């Protein structure tokens, strides 16, 4: 029920596993901010 997009803080990785298993019906590309292939992935996700 977020309005602003969340910022998940998880040292354990359980939240990352939960969100990957939850939003798996749609398409998720797990990117990173330091990845070079980030702007293209963001633009593709924004358009799609």
């Amino acid at each position: 029920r977020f309005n602003r997009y969340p910022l998940i803080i998880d040292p354990s990785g359980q939240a990352t596993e939960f969100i990957m298993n939850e939003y798996k019906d749609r398409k998720i590309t797990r990117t990173s901010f330091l990845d070079d292939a980030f702007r293209k992935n963001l633009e593709s996700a924004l358009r799609f």
């Binding site: 398409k27 593709s44 799609f48």
Partner: protein, 49 residues
Amino acid sequence: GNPLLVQDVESYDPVLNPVLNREVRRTGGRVLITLGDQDIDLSPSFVIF
């Protein structure tokens, strides 16, 4: 996703070449055809005459 009927083929526009050739990209669940510089999502219920 609308049917399209274009007349006067004699002044043919070669922007229709990927559409007629079905040069289609299937990245993810979407369906992509690239005409010119713009990338356009292609609906399944499209025909042209």
